[PDB]
Structures are given as structure tokens and as C-alpha cells.
PDB file of C-alpha atoms (C1' of nucleotides) in Angstrom:
ATOM      1  CA  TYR A  75      -5.394   7.048 109.154  1.00 54.57           C
ATOM      2  CA  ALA A  76      -8.193   9.062 107.716  1.00 52.52           C
ATOM      3  CA  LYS A  77      -8.309  11.100 104.469  1.00 47.45           C
ATOM      4  CA  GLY A  78     -11.093  13.835 104.626  1.00 52.16           C
ATOM      5  CA  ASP A  79     -14.288  11.695 104.301  1.00 54.07           C
ATOM      6  CA  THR A  80     -12.445   7.948 104.148  1.00 57.44           C
ATOM      7  CA  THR A  81     -11.090   6.438 107.460  1.00 54.09           C
ATOM      8  CA  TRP A  82      -8.761   3.785 107.772  1.00 54.92           C
ATOM      9  CA  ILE A  83      -8.109   1.597 110.887  1.00 53.60           C
ATOM     10  CA  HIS A  84      -5.841  -1.455 110.924  1.00 52.36           C
ATOM     11  CA  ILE A  85      -5.502  -3.654 114.160  1.00 52.67           C
ATOM     12  CA  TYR A  86      -2.957  -6.330 113.958  1.00 50.81           C
ATOM     13  CA  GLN A  87      -3.292  -8.430 116.897  1.00 51.25           C
ATOM     14  CA  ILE A  88      -0.343 -10.756 118.347  1.00 52.34           C
ATOM     15  CA  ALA A  89      -0.867 -14.517 119.153  1.00 51.24           C
ATOM     16  CA  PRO A  90       1.170 -17.223 120.703  1.00 52.79           C
ATOM     17  CA  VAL A  91       1.891 -20.467 119.132  1.00 52.61           C
ATOM     18  CA  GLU A  92       3.061 -22.844 121.759  1.00 53.36           C
ATOM     19  CA  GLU A  93       3.623 -21.081 125.199  1.00 50.69           C
ATOM     20  CA  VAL A  94       4.263 -17.671 126.682  1.00 49.41           C
ATOM     21  CA  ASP A  95       5.089 -16.034 130.137  1.00 50.32           C
ATOM     22  CA  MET A  96       4.514 -12.751 131.983  1.00 52.20           C
ATOM     23  CA  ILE A  97       7.757 -11.619 130.419  1.00 52.41           C
ATOM     24  CA  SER A  98       6.035 -12.154 126.930  1.00 51.08           C
ATOM     25  CA  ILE A  99       2.741 -10.509 128.273  1.00 48.53           C
ATOM     26  CA  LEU A 100       4.471  -7.351 129.507  1.00 50.13           C
ATOM     27  CA  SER A 101       6.561  -7.099 126.285  1.00 48.30           C
ATOM     28  CA  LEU A 102       3.495  -7.215 124.262  1.00 49.65           C
ATOM     29  CA  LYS A 103       2.028  -4.514 126.455  1.00 48.38           C
ATOM     30  CA  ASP A 104       4.808  -2.422 125.949  1.00 46.18           C
ATOM     31  CA  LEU A 105       4.601  -3.122 122.197  1.00 46.83           C
ATOM     32  CA  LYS A 106       1.230  -0.902 122.290  1.00 44.53           C
ATOM     33  CA  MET A 107       2.193   2.505 121.353  1.00 44.69           C
ATOM     34  CA  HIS A 108       1.220   5.245 118.491  1.00 46.27           C
ATOM     35  CA  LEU A 109      -1.227   7.197 120.672  1.00 43.98           C
ATOM     36  CA  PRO A 110      -4.416   8.138 118.745  1.00 40.51           C
ATOM     37  CA  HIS A 111      -3.612  11.588 117.700  1.00 41.05           C
ATOM     38  CA  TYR A 112      -0.180  12.335 116.045  1.00 41.00           C
ATOM     39  CA  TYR A 113      -1.211  14.297 113.352  1.00 42.57           C
ATOM     40  CA  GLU A 114      -0.170  17.973 112.953  1.00 44.70           C
ATOM     41  CA  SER A 115       1.291  18.227 109.450  1.00 46.62           C
ATOM     42  CA  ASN A 116       2.603  14.711 108.694  1.00 45.95           C
ATOM     43  CA  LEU A 117      -0.576  14.124 106.386  1.00 44.41           C
ATOM     44  CA  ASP A 118       0.741  16.558 103.979  1.00 40.51           C
ATOM     45  CA  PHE A 119       3.241  13.599 102.969  1.00 38.26           C
ATOM     46  CA  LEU A 120       1.249  10.721 104.028  1.00 40.54           C
ATOM     47  CA  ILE A 121      -1.186  10.594 101.098  1.00 39.33           C
ATOM     48  CA  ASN A 122      -1.373   6.895 100.617  1.00 41.61           C
ATOM     49  CA  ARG A 123      -2.620   4.737 103.230  1.00 42.47           C
ATOM     50  CA  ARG A 124       0.192   2.272 102.833  1.00 40.46           C
ATOM     51  CA  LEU A 125       2.775   4.897 103.344  1.00 40.11           C
ATOM     52  CA  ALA A 126       0.801   6.155 106.501  1.00 42.11           C
ATOM     53  CA  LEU A 127       0.933   2.420 107.764  1.00 39.97           C
ATOM     54  CA  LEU A 128       4.741   2.272 107.145  1.00 42.32           C
ATOM     55  CA  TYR A 129       5.240   5.453 108.941  1.00 44.14           C
ATOM     56  CA  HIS A 130       3.312   4.492 111.921  1.00 42.91           C
ATOM     57  CA  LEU A 131       5.029   1.041 111.959  1.00 41.82           C
ATOM     58  CA  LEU A 132       8.307   2.932 112.053  1.00 43.04           C
ATOM     59  CA  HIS A 133       7.701   3.979 115.520  1.00 47.42           C
ATOM     60  CA  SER A 134       6.406   0.821 116.740  1.00 43.34           C
ATOM     61  CA  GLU A 135       8.614  -2.177 117.935  1.00 43.65           C
ATOM     62  CA  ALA A 136       9.583  -5.269 115.923  1.00 42.93           C
ATOM     63  CA  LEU A 137      11.473  -7.444 118.828  1.00 45.53           C
ATOM     64  CA  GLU A 138       9.801 -10.772 119.737  1.00 43.55           C
ATOM     65  CA  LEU A 139      13.035 -12.950 120.215  1.00 43.89           C
ATOM     66  CA  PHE A 140      13.191 -11.756 123.815  1.00 44.36           C
ATOM     67  CA  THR A 141      10.181 -13.769 125.025  1.00 45.49           C
ATOM     68  CA  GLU A 142      11.917 -17.229 124.453  1.00 42.91           C
ATOM     69  CA  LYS A 143       8.882 -18.175 122.163  1.00 40.82           C
ATOM     70  CA  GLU A 144       8.168 -16.561 118.779  1.00 40.41           C
ATOM     71  CA  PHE A 145       4.749 -15.082 118.187  1.00 39.67           C
ATOM     72  CA  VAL A 146       2.349 -14.499 115.131  1.00 39.85           C
ATOM     73  CA  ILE A 147       0.389 -11.630 114.000  1.00 41.21           C
ATOM     74  CA  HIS A 148      -3.221 -11.282 112.598  1.00 40.52           C
ATOM     75  CA  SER A 149      -4.199  -8.095 110.987  1.00 43.71           C
ATOM     76  CA  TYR A 150      -7.742  -6.822 110.482  1.00 45.64           C
ATOM     77  CA  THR A 151      -8.811  -3.415 108.490  1.00 41.71           C
ATOM     78  CA  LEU A 152     -11.857  -1.397 108.810  1.00 44.19           C
ATOM     79  CA  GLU A 153     -12.762   1.498 106.289  1.00 43.36           C
ATOM     80  CA  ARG A 154     -15.317   4.220 106.445  1.00 45.02           C
ATOM     81  CA  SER A 155     -16.056   5.968 103.208  1.00 44.60           C
ATOM     82  CA  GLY A 156     -19.065   8.314 103.171  1.00 47.02           C
ATOM     83  CA  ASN A 157     -20.193   6.823 106.765  1.00 46.46           C
ATOM     84  CA  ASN A 158     -20.077   3.238 105.375  1.00 47.74           C
ATOM     85  CA  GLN A 159     -18.209   0.692 107.396  1.00 48.39           C
ATOM     86  CA  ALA A 160     -17.221  -2.678 106.363  1.00 51.00           C
ATOM     87  CA  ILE A 161     -14.236  -5.234 106.377  1.00 52.06           C
ATOM     88  CA  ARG A 162     -11.864  -5.392 103.450  1.00 55.63           C
ATOM     89  CA  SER A 163      -9.119  -7.413 105.116  1.00 59.18           C
ATOM     90  CA  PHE A 164      -9.291 -10.238 107.483  1.00 59.89           C
ATOM     91  CA  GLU A 165      -5.934 -12.228 106.968  1.00 59.44           C
ATOM     92  CA  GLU A 166      -3.524 -10.299 104.783  1.00 59.02           C
ATOM     93  CA  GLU A 167       0.244 -10.599 104.786  1.00 63.61           C
ATOM     94  CA  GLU A 168       1.277  -7.084 103.761  1.00 62.38           C
ATOM     95  CA  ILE A 169       1.334  -5.679 107.350  1.00 63.29           C
ATOM     96  CA  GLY A 170       3.532  -8.855 108.139  1.00 63.35           C
ATOM     97  CA  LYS A 171       5.964  -8.499 105.599  1.00 66.17           C
ATOM     98  CA  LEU A 172       6.127  -4.859 106.102  1.00 65.68           C
ATOM     99  CA  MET A 173       6.849  -5.523 109.845  1.00 62.95           C
ATOM    100  CA  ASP A 174       9.596  -8.386 109.062  1.00 62.67           C
ATOM    101  CA  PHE A 175      11.413  -5.880 106.441  1.00 64.03           C
ATOM    102  CA  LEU A 176      11.340  -3.219 108.969  1.00 61.80           C
ATOM    103  CA  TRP A 177      12.701  -5.246 111.648  1.00 61.75           C
ATOM    104  CA  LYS A 178      15.461  -6.496 109.262  1.00 61.39           C
ATOM    105  CA  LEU A 179      16.171  -2.735 108.243  1.00 58.26           C
ATOM    106  CA  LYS A 180      16.688  -1.250 111.678  1.00 57.87           C
ATOM    107  CA  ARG A 181      18.434  -4.149 113.389  1.00 55.17           C
ATOM    108  CA  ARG A 182      21.646  -2.836 111.915  1.00 56.81           C
ATOM    109  CA  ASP A 183      20.757   0.831 113.431  1.00 55.09           C
ATOM    110  CA  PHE A 184      17.827   2.770 114.660  1.00 56.09           C
ATOM    111  CA  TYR A 185      19.273   6.413 114.450  1.00 57.23           C
ATOM    112  CA  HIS A 186      20.399   6.338 110.745  1.00 54.14           C
ATOM    113  CA  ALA A 187      17.185   4.109 109.982  1.00 56.39           C
ATOM    114  CA  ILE A 188      15.059   6.507 111.463  1.00 57.13           C
ATOM    115  CA  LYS A 189      16.682   9.596 109.897  1.00 58.23           C
ATOM    116  CA  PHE A 190      16.476   7.851 106.605  1.00 62.49           C
ATOM    117  CA  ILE A 191      12.896   6.945 106.567  1.00 60.70           C
ATOM    118  CA  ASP A 192      11.968  10.228 108.024  1.00 61.31           C
ATOM    119  CA  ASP A 193      13.845  12.257 105.331  1.00 61.67           C
ATOM    120  CA  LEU A 194      12.505  10.025 102.387  1.00 59.90           C
ATOM    121  CA  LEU A 195       8.941  10.579 103.783  1.00 56.89           C
ATOM    122  CA  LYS A 196       9.244  14.269 104.316  1.00 57.43           C
ATOM    123  CA  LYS A 197      10.748  15.201 101.076  1.00 63.37           C
ATOM    124  CA  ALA A 198      11.721  12.010  98.746  1.00 67.63           C
ATOM    125  CA  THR A 199       8.041  11.273  98.468  1.00 70.46           C
ATOM    126  CA  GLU A 200       8.909   9.638  95.304  1.00 71.71           C
ATOM    127  CA  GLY A 201      11.285   7.477  97.132  1.00 71.97           C
ATOM    128  CA  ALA A 202       8.640   6.646  99.557  1.00 73.32           C
ATOM    129  CA  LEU A 203       6.365   5.277  97.030  1.00 71.15           C
ATOM    130  CA  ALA A 204       9.250   3.432  95.444  1.00 69.80           C
ATOM    131  CA  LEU A 205      10.035   1.700  98.817  1.00 71.94           C
ATOM    132  CA  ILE A 206       6.259   0.922  99.276  1.00 72.85           C
ATOM    133  CA  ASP A 207       6.148  -0.456  95.704  1.00 74.88           C
ATOM    134  CA  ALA A 208       9.340  -2.371  96.508  1.00 72.60           C
ATOM    135  CA  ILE A 209       7.505  -3.863  99.575  1.00 68.83           C
ATOM    136  CA  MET A 210       4.107  -4.125  98.113  1.00 69.13           C
ATOM    137  CA  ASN A 211       4.557  -6.402  95.132  1.00 67.60           C
ATOM    138  CA  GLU A 212       8.153  -7.029  96.134  1.00 66.76           C
ATOM    139  CA  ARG A 213      10.659  -6.226  93.352  1.00 66.51           C
ATOM    140  CA  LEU A 214      14.107  -5.294  94.585  1.00 66.77           C
ATOM    141  CA  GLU A 215      15.163  -2.877  92.056  1.00 64.54           C
ATOM    142  CA  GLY A 216      12.494  -0.291  93.619  1.00 63.96           C
ATOM    143  CA  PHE A 217      14.596  -0.296  96.627  1.00 67.06           C
ATOM    144  CA  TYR A 218      17.335   1.408  94.598  1.00 65.41           C
ATOM    145  CA  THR A 219      15.219   3.858  93.207  1.00 67.57           C
ATOM    146  CA  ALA A 220      14.251   5.029  96.861  1.00 67.91           C
ATOM    147  CA  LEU A 221      17.971   5.051  97.629  1.00 67.15           C
ATOM    148  CA  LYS A 222      18.421   7.362  94.347  1.00 69.96           C
ATOM    149  CA  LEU A 223      15.623   9.599  95.881  1.00 69.95           C
ATOM    150  CA  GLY A 224      17.791   9.605  98.948  1.00 68.84           C
ATOM    151  CA  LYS A 225      20.463  11.277  97.404  1.00 68.11           C
ATOM    152  CA  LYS A 226      18.016  13.775  96.221  1.00 64.17           C
ATOM    153  CA  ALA A 227      16.702  14.028  99.758  1.00 62.62           C
ATOM    154  CA  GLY A 228      20.349  14.659 101.224  1.00 62.26           C
ATOM    155  CA  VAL A 229      20.248  11.468 103.134  1.00 57.54           C
ATOM    156  CA  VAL A 230      23.272  10.268 104.942  1.00 55.56           C
ATOM    157  CA  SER A 231      23.018   6.874 103.787  1.00 56.06           C
ATOM    158  CA  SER A 232      24.841   5.067 106.309  1.00 56.83           C
ATOM    159  CA  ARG A 233      26.829   2.135 105.780  1.00 58.03           C
ATOM    160  CA  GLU A 234      24.881  -0.286 107.917  1.00 60.34           C
ATOM    161  CA  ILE A 235      21.423   0.698 106.312  1.00 58.58           C
ATOM    162  CA  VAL A 236      22.366  -0.816 102.886  1.00 59.05           C
ATOM    163  CA  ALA A 237      24.053  -3.869 104.652  1.00 60.04           C
ATOM    164  CA  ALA A 238      20.722  -4.508 106.191  1.00 61.85           C
ATOM    165  CA  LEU A 239      19.113  -3.971 103.070  1.00 61.64           C
ATOM    166  CA  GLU A 240      21.242  -6.649 101.660  1.00 60.27           C
ATOM    167  CA  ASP A 241      20.523  -9.037 104.319  1.00 59.93           C
ATOM    168  CA  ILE A 242      16.630  -8.448 103.533  1.00 58.37           C
ATOM    169  CA  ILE A 243      17.754  -9.284  99.990  1.00 54.85           C
ATOM    170  CA  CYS A 244      19.466 -12.942 100.895  1.00 51.82           C
TER     171      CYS A 244
ATOM    172  C1'  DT B 246      80.349 -35.955  21.928  1.00 49.59           C
ATOM    173  C1'  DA B 247      78.256 -33.461  26.937  1.00 51.96           C
ATOM    174  C1'  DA B 248      73.481 -31.175  29.714  1.00 51.24           C
ATOM    175  C1'  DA B 249      76.179 -27.033  36.857  1.00 50.45           C
ATOM    176  C1'  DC B 250      79.501 -28.575  40.131  1.00 49.54           C
ATOM    177  C1'  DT B 251      78.924 -24.893  45.434  1.00 50.47           C
ATOM    178  C1'  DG B 252      79.902 -21.896  49.351  1.00 46.98           C
ATOM    179  C1'  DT B 253      75.325 -18.980  50.176  1.00 46.41           C
ATOM    180  C1'  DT B 254      68.937 -18.175  51.361  1.00 45.42           C
ATOM    181  C1'  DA B 255      70.566 -11.818  54.030  1.00 45.55           C
ATOM    182  C1'  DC B 256      72.812  -9.815  58.542  1.00 46.61           C
ATOM    183  C1'  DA B 257      72.190  -6.212  62.504  1.00 46.46           C
ATOM    184  C1'  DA B 258      69.978  -1.828  64.934  1.00 44.37           C
ATOM    185  C1'  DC B 259      64.744  -1.667  65.914  1.00 44.30           C
ATOM    186  C1'  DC B 260      59.126  -3.636  66.636  1.00 41.54           C
ATOM    187  C1'  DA B 261      56.368   3.429  68.960  1.00 39.22           C
ATOM    188  C1'  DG B 262      58.252   7.559  71.196  1.00 38.84           C
ATOM    189  C1'  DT B 263      54.848  11.015  74.353  1.00 38.86           C
ATOM    190  C1'  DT B 264      50.431  13.511  75.429  1.00 38.24           C
ATOM    191  C1'  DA B 265      45.681  13.228  77.024  1.00 36.45           C
ATOM    192  C1'  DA B 266      41.168   8.061  77.637  1.00 35.94           C
ATOM    193  C1'  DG B 267      35.913  13.141  78.073  1.00 37.13           C
ATOM    194  C1'  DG B 268      35.521  18.495  79.344  1.00 34.19           C
ATOM    195  C1'  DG B 269      30.985  20.330  80.534  1.00 37.84           C
ATOM    196  C1'  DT B 270      26.001  20.775  81.639  1.00 37.79           C
ATOM    197  C1'  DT B 271      21.661  18.947  83.341  1.00 37.77           C
ATOM    198  C1'  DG B 272      19.694  13.234  86.729  1.00 36.12           C
ATOM    199  C1'  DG B 273      11.800  13.418  86.002  1.00 35.44           C
ATOM    200  C1'  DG B 274       9.710  17.956  85.926  1.00 33.47           C
ATOM    201  C1'  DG B 275       4.063  17.862  87.706  1.00 33.37           C
ATOM    202  C1'  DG B 276      -0.511  16.887  88.026  1.00 34.90           C
ATOM    203  C1'  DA B 277      -2.856  12.348  91.713  1.00 33.67           C
ATOM    204  C1'  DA B 278      -1.874   8.234  94.933  1.00 34.59           C
ATOM    205  C1'  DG B 279     -10.195   5.769  94.062  1.00 33.27           C
ATOM    206  C1'  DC B 280     -13.684   8.163  92.530  1.00 33.88           C
ATOM    207  C1'  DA B 281     -19.693   5.243  95.069  1.00 39.35           C
ATOM    208  C1'  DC B 282     -22.227   1.710  95.232  1.00 39.06           C
ATOM    209  C1'  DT B 283     -22.692  -1.637  99.818  1.00 41.05           C
ATOM    210  C1'  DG B 284     -23.764   1.957 107.553  1.00 37.78           C
ATOM    211  C1'  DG B 285     -24.230  -0.404 112.784  1.00 39.61           C
ATOM    212  C1'  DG B 286     -25.325   0.434 116.331  1.00 37.31           C
ATOM    213  C1'  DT B 287     -30.180   1.430 119.800  1.00 39.10           C
ATOM    214  C1'  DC B 288     -34.126   2.271 120.455  1.00 40.73           C
ATOM    215  C1'  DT B 289     -39.743   2.585 119.351  1.00 41.70           C
TER     216       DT B 289
END
DNA sequence: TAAACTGTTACAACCAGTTAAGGGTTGGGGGAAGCACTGGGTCT
């Protein structure tokens, strides 16, 4: 995600812990998605880097219980503001917790979850920032405000979405 | 010259009737969501 002059790239590599197999290897190969250039108009609502990261992680995959062995993720980021490249994040949890939240949200449905997230990103930008503030610096009430903007966005707000959110709440 | 004896301490009905317990009108507008500073390679 690049904004005019600044350019951000976040690579999150997957590593094993005990053992893997070719099924796991090919599953990780299938995890590779989100082709380089997907920018036609979405940037008009992407604005914040975290929001764009969440939107792009929406189209990614979040299933790892298939391989019979669970995985771990290490994420590193690179920035380029004014043609200056360096590292500002080598081991940060926000990708991991965002990925876990996405996995636990869309487990109860993918069609309604996709519709909800897409609608809030498109028109309920306040709700999108509210959700990212509920994930970044985790505070549960922010989720509610996002859902509030959902009614401002005409979101269907299916039964299973709030159930998945409550399961995330624990 | 004596200093209240006694039945009696209310009965009975009844102990809110109805009507509605918000009507409406609006549920963040609107801007921004890092500005630089720190450049990594490959060559001479």
C-alpha cells in the first residue's frame, strides 16, 4: 500500500513449529494471493495503512488446522517516504491478532462477512476506523460503534456475524 | 353511713373504576487519518 510518496510493504512469513508435510507446503503455497496491482478506486477509502492491510487480509486465507500441525507467523514491514527505505517493524503482533480476529469472524460465514466488511470499507469509513481502533489497542466497545455505522451503511448484519464477534469476545 | 355494678369497643358494603405509559423530529456533520529528518544498491 503506497500513498503518493510513501510506500509500505508488509511481508508476513509462515513458519512451522514441530513438523510439516507436502499437504502443509502446498496449503502455504495456496495461501499466496493478493496479486500486486489491485488498485483501481479502492484507495479512495483505504486512506490509513492499517485499513488497507485489513482490507487486503480480508481476501487472504486464515485456515491452518488442515495440516494436522499448527503454524506461526513472523511479519516484517518496509517503508519508503521520500525515497528513503528502512525497517520500522520486525516482530509485531498487530498482523497476527488482526489475522486471528479475521479468522474467528469469518468462520461463521464468509458471504455475509465479506459483504459487511466491504460495505463498511466502502461507505461506513467511520465504522472501518472504529473497527481498526477496536483491533489496534483492543477495546470491545469500538466494535459496537462499527456495527452502529453498519446501520448507517445499510448492512444486512446477519445473525452469525454477531455470534462470531461474541465468540471473539469470549 | 356508702364511692358503679354490666351487656357493649361499631357492624356491613367497599379498598379505584377506565383511558392512554410518549407523539413527533432528528442519530456526528466535516475537515485529516504524519508532516522530514535518517536511501541501497552498483559501479568507478
